[PDB]
Design a protein around this ligand. Sequence first.
Ligand code: AAV
Ligand code: CL
Length: 350
Amino acid sequence: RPTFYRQELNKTIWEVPERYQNLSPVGSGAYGSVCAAFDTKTGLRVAVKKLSRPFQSIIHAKRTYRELRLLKHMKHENVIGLLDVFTPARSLEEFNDVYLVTHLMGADLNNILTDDHVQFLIYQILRGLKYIHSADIIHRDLKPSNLAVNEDCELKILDFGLARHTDDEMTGYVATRWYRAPEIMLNWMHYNQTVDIWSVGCIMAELLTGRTLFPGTDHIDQLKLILRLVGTPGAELLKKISSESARNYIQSLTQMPKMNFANVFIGANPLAVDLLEKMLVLDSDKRITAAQALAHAYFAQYHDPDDEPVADPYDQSFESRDLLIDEWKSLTYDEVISFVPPPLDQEEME
Ligand SMILES: Cc1ccc(C(=O)Nc2ccon2)cc1-n1cnc2ccc(N3CCN(C)CC3)cc2c1=O
Ligand SMILES: [Cl-]
C-alpha cells in the first residue's frame, strides 16, 4: 500500500499517496475541492478531487458510485478519464473518503477566437460527445466551464452524466441555465442525446461572437431569449408538447419570427452559420446528432470517419436501483479495489 501523508487545505484535511506532491487548490469541481498536484510516478501534472462527504446520504452515496463508474469506463482522447483513484482507509469499515485523479488541463473554455480555433474546439467536443452518446450517456449540462483545454487547444469534456435524469430524483448537481436545451429546462417534450447538441450550439455561438447567446434571468426570460432567435414553434412542434401550461407560455408570448442566422452571426464562416442552424432547433427529433454533425462541411478540415471511435458497452442498471448507503458504499469500494491504472508506455507526454 502507498505511503500516505496529510495536510489541511482551506479548512479540509487531505490524505494522499506520497507520489502526488505540491497540492495547490484551484476551486470547486463537481461535488468537492480540486487540487493541482505533480505526479512523481509519471512526471505528469494532475488534478486531484476530494469528494465532499461521499456517503452522508443515498444521494451522495449513489452519485459517488456513478462518478467512479463513469470515469473508469471513459477511454477517449476528448473525454476526461480516470488516471487513479484512492482512499486512505485500509478496509471497508472505515471507508469514508474518495479522491479521484485525472490529467490537469491548463484551463477551460470559460477562461479562454478565429474560425479555425472554433472549428477545432467544436470538432473535439463533437468527437468526445459521439463517444459518450454511443454508450447511452448524456451530458445533460455541457457548458464552457466543463470544457477543459490545453495550450495546444486540445480539449477534454468533464462532468458528463451527473445532472439529474428526471423530476423524480435529485443528484445534488447544479446545472447552468444558459446552455440548457429548452426541452430539459421546461420538461416540455421528450428528450434525447441532442440536448447536448443544443449546448454545443450555445457554446459555438459564444466562441465566435464573444457573447452569451441566451443569458436568461429565469426559466421564462430564457424561453423568451431563445424564441426571439429560433422563433415560436409551429403547429408541428406544438403537437409534441405534453404540458398544457408549457403551450400557453408559447402561444401567448407574442409570436416571434425566426431570425436570419447570417444577420445574427455576421462575418462568421457561412458553413459555421449552417451548423448552428442545424444545432439550434427546438424539435429534439430534428436536431442534428453528434455523429451527423461530425460529417458537416464545416469540419471538412478535421474530419475522419475511421478516427471518431465509439465506446464499449456500458452497464448502468445501477441507475434504476434503490439501495442503502451501505450498499452504495461497498460497491464504490470494490470499484476502488479493482482499479488498474491506464497503460504507461516508454513515451513521455505533456
Ligand atoms: C479532478 C476531476 C475529477 C473528475 C472530473 C469529472 O469529470 N468527473 C466525472 C463524473 C462523471 O463524469 N465525469 C473532473 C475533474 N477535474 C479535472 N480537472 C480540473 C481542472 C481544474 C478544475 N478547476 C478549475 C478552476 N475552477 C475555478 C475550479 C475547478 C477542476 C477540475 C476537475 O474537476
Ligand atoms: Cl448539456
